[PDB]
Design a protein around this ligand. Sequence first.
Ligand SMILES: [Ca+2]
Ligand SMILES: [Ca+2]
Ligand SMILES: [Ca+2]
Ligand SMILES: [Ca+2]
Lengths: 63, 63, 63, 63
Amino acid sequence: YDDELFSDVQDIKTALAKIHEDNQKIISKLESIPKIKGEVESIKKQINRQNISISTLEGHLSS
Amino acid sequence: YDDELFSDVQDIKTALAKIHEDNQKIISKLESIPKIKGEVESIKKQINRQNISISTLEGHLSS
Amino acid sequence: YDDELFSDVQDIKTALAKIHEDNQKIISKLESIPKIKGEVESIKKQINRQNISISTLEGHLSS
Amino acid sequence: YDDELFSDVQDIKTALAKIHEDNQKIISKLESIPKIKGEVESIKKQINRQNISISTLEGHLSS
Ligand SMILES: [Ca+2]
Ligand SMILES: [Ca+2]
Ligand SMILES: [Ca+2]
Ligand SMILES: [Ca+2]
């Protein structure tokens, strides 16, 4: 096991450890994606109820 | 093929397998991004129709 | 250069190529993030204009 | 340290450097995810206030 190859293998291991670390940082930042999807689907639902309220107001005014 | 180099190569392979695994976890979490974009574009569309309804209500009231 | 080490180095290269490929797939899926941010900021703007229209309708009714 | 193994180790290092570079590009693209979550939660809040305004307009009209 040559010292230089040993040193380069340790460099490869260090690089791999940094990539793994960065992947978990990525997975953490992706934790709020299902929160956003949920909130967006809730907004859509609230807007639909609102469209109905405005349509009811349109009816009650046309009298 | 030195045992120690063999053992370190297996460590490199294990690290690579974990990164690959984490990439698929990342790709899975990114599956709901086109759902969010679609929903957001739908909200915008519903809001525009709503703005028109409120503008119509403004007209029908000013009579 | 031992055949077995040669074969394992080629395995390492194949694994690396798959990870690189998966990163570009990830970057592609992340292309619609600035579209979503933009649309969301537009919705907020449209909602504010709407809140004003409803407040104007409240005033015109209280007469 | 065989020249061919040396050359392949340098290829492994180059591949690792490209993946690391791509991870930071990924982390950068993920910077606007907490902006989107925040804006979406703000929209929801504005919509709720709006639903109340329309409900108040419904009351003031039914008189
Ligand atoms: Ca070196
Ligand atoms: Ca070891
Ligand atoms: Ca093998
Ligand atoms: Ca080569």
